[PDB]
Design an enzyme around this catalytic site. Structure first.
Site, mmCIF file in Angstrom:
data_model
loop_
_atom_site.group_PDB
_atom_site.id
_atom_site.type_symbol
_atom_site.label_atom_id
_atom_site.label_comp_id
_atom_site.label_asym_id
_atom_site.label_seq_id
_atom_site.Cartn_x
_atom_site.Cartn_y
_atom_site.Cartn_z
ATOM 1 N N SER A 28 12.914 -22.656 11.403
ATOM 2 C CA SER A 28 12.927 -21.366 11.180
ATOM 3 C C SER A 28 13.747 -20.638 11.341
ATOM 4 O O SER A 28 14.320 -19.326 11.202
ATOM 5 C CB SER A 28 11.926 -21.220 12.107
ATOM 6 O OG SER A 28 10.880 -21.302 11.057
ATOM 7 N N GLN B 163 2.607 -20.542 5.163
ATOM 8 C CA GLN B 163 3.286 -20.486 3.809
ATOM 9 C C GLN B 163 3.023 -20.318 2.725
ATOM 10 O O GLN B 163 2.181 -20.176 2.352
ATOM 11 C CB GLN B 163 2.960 -22.960 4.195
ATOM 12 C CG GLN B 163 3.220 -22.995 5.585
ATOM 13 C CD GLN B 163 4.456 -23.199 6.180
ATOM 14 O OE1 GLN B 163 5.515 -22.855 5.223
ATOM 15 N NE2 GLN B 163 4.652 -23.726 7.866
ATOM 16 N N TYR C 208 3.247 -13.011 11.093
ATOM 17 C CA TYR C 208 4.853 -13.910 10.482
ATOM 18 C C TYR C 208 4.617 -14.870 9.488
ATOM 19 O O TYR C 208 3.952 -15.597 9.459
ATOM 20 C CB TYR C 208 5.328 -14.405 11.966
ATOM 21 C CG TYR C 208 6.393 -15.928 12.151
ATOM 22 C CD1 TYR C 208 6.227 -16.866 11.262
ATOM 23 C CD2 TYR C 208 7.948 -15.351 12.562
ATOM 24 C CE1 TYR C 208 7.429 -17.849 11.061
ATOM 25 C CE2 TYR C 208 8.800 -15.787 12.394
ATOM 26 C CZ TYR C 208 8.842 -17.027 11.377
ATOM 27 O OH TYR C 208 10.076 -18.143 11.371
HETATM 28 C C1 LIG Z 1 9.959 -22.663 11.821
HETATM 29 O O1 LIG Z 1 10.767 -23.145 11.534
HETATM 30 N N1 LIG Z 1 8.566 -21.899 11.383
HETATM 31 C C2 LIG Z 1 7.720 -21.339 11.296
HETATM 32 C C3 LIG Z 1 6.398 -21.041 11.714
HETATM 33 N N2 LIG Z 1 6.609 -21.226 13.256
HETATM 34 O O2 LIG Z 1 8.020 -20.372 14.024
HETATM 35 S S1 LIG Z 1 8.616 -21.014 14.107
HETATM 36 O O3 LIG Z 1 9.545 -22.242 14.194
HETATM 37 O O4 LIG Z 1 7.986 -20.778 16.044
HETATM 38 O O5 LIG Z 1 9.848 -19.864 14.692
HETATM 39 C C4 LIG Z 1 5.891 -22.487 11.988
HETATM 40 C C5 LIG Z 1 6.768 -23.796 12.017
HETATM 41 C C6 LIG Z 1 8.227 -23.365 11.067
HETATM 42 C C7 LIG Z 1 7.645 -23.750 10.145
HETATM 43 O O6 LIG Z 1 7.206 -23.272 9.001
HETATM 44 N N3 LIG Z 1 8.970 -25.139 9.508
HETATM 45 N N4 LIG Z 1 8.647 -25.878 8.042
HETATM 46 C C8 LIG Z 1 7.503 -26.761 7.896
HETATM 47 O O7 LIG Z 1 6.578 -26.803 8.922
HETATM 48 C C9 LIG Z 1 6.818 -27.154 6.676
HETATM 49 C C10 LIG Z 1 7.514 -28.296 6.203
HETATM 50 C C11 LIG Z 1 6.722 -28.849 4.544
HETATM 51 C C12 LIG Z 1 5.259 -27.482 4.266
HETATM 52 N N5 LIG Z 1 6.409 -26.303 4.419
HETATM 53 C C13 LIG Z 1 7.203 -26.052 5.540
#
Ligand SMILES: *C(=O)N1C[C@H](NOS(=O)(=O)O)CC[C@H]1C(=O)NNC(=O)[C@@H]1CCCNC1
Ligand SMILES: [Cl-]
Ligand SMILES: [Zn+2]
Length: 358
Positions: free
Chosen positions: A61, A117, A147
């Site tokens: 992210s 997501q 978020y």
């Molecule tokens: C960003 O890295 N995020 C968004 C959220 N956490 O916010 S943060 O990292 O703490 O700032 C959730 C975890 C992460 C994210 O969504 N990464 N991508 C994935 O988790 C998935 C991989 C496969 C399926 N869809 C996305």
């Protein structure tokens, strides 16, 4: 590096690696505007390939900071306005719940409960339209921050439409290339795969899988050197010769909403400096960071405040990243690891280092 930097980095990061069982890590400490690099461990355990300053890590992210700045650059070009309705850029979004949802709302997670997501079942453009057409908001626009990759992801995809470029081409031409981030990729080219670290989850080597709006929300890969240059660019926007990009950086650090002691930018999040370290450490826990919270609008948005702690976390299945910087102090840090380990541990280590060096 200066002895004080070497000392604090060893005493903070080596124990973090011990505590969290991180296989490979790269850190850049920006002190008086200059990066100092540190690496530990392996990019590929089985091949015994060490982490180097050329190793690519998944930013997760942290990618949103690039998306926010690209959107700011589009604002500075006059291509979009944050007050524009989403439907200006996607008129097929005819469902009535989209009335009143602006690009600002998408960019800042305030559209009214777009989900964390995009569903994994979304594999095509028509799938994506159906998803947004059927989504029902839990709240009115501009009242609650939740978020969401599906929110800023759509912002990024729409923000590039006036340019006629794909999201990837716009990012490469308008952000990566002018900043000389020549080892930063949405899609790693074949000749660069040799430098792409593996992420490690439950002992298994993994890379992030393709998903809808991935490039915009979580899909960038970069080296510690390019990420240090990204921090330098965000610390010193006036050093950027391209005026729209200089201004886009500044707009991404403007304060659009406040909740508690945190301010939402475009991708970046900000707090006043000096910060209460417990608020950034505790606030990074996913139970808190991902909860819905009421926001207060800042109108007009506060122009980027130099006395700020500016930061972003990111993770994928196999990686954990963190970037933080303080413009007034010309001080920053990038931490890239090939294990996803808890955000509070990242933020605590970053604050110990930057606090020691202020
Ligand atoms: C960003 O890295 N995020 C968004 C959220 N956490 O916010 S943060 O990292 O703490 O700032 C959730 C975890 C992460 C994210 O969504 N990464 N991508 C994935 O988790 C998935 C991989 C496969 C399926 N869809 C996305
Ligand atoms: Cl020690
Ligand atoms: Zn020691």
């Amino acid at each position: 590096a200066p002895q004080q930097i070497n000392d604090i980095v060893h005493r903070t990061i080596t124990p973090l690696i011990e505590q969290q069982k991180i296989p490979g890590m790269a850190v850049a400490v920006i002190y008086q505007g200059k990066p100092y690099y540190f690496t530990w461990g392996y990019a590929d355990i089985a091949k015994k390939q060490p982490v180097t300053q050329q190793t690519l890590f998944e930013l997760g992210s942290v990618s949103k900071t690039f998306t926010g700045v690209l959107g700011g650059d589009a604002i500075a070009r006059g291509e979009i306005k944050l007050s524009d309705p989403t439907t200006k850029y996607w008129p097929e979004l005819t469902a009535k719940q989209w009335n009143g949802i602006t690009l600002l709302h998408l960019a800042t997670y305030t559209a009214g409960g777009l989900p964390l997501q995009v569903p994994d079942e979304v594999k095509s453009s028509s799938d994506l339209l159906r998803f947004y057409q059927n989504w029902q908001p839990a709240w009115a626009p501009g009242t609650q921050r939740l978020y969401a990759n599906s929110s800023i992801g759509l912002f990024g995809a729409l923000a590039v439409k006036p340019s006629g470029l794909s999201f990837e081409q716009a990012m490469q031409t308008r952000v990566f290339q002018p900043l000389k981030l020549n080892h930063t990729w949405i899609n790693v080219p074949p000749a660069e795969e040799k430098n792409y670290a593996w992420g490690y989850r439950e002992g298994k080597a993994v890379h992030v899988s393709p998903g809808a709006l991935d490039a915009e929300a979580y899909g960038v890969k970069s080296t510690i050197e390019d990420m240090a240059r990204w921090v330098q660019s965000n610390l010193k926007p006036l050093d950027i010769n391209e005026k729209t990009l200089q201004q886009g950086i500044q707009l991404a650090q403007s304060r659009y909403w406040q909740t508690g002691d945190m301010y939402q930018g475009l991708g970046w999040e900000m707090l006043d400096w000096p910060v209460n370290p417990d608020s950034i450490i505790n606030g990074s826990d996913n139970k808190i960071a991902l909860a819905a919270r009421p926001v207060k609008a800042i109108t007009p948005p506060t122009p980027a405040v130099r006395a700020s702690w500016v930061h972003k976390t990111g993770a994928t299945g196999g990686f954990g990243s963190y970037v933080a910087f303080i413009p007034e102090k010309e001080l920053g840090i990038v931490m890239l690891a090939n294990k996803n380990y808890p955000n509070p541990a990242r933020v605590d280590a970053a604050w110990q280092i930057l606090n020691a060096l202020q």
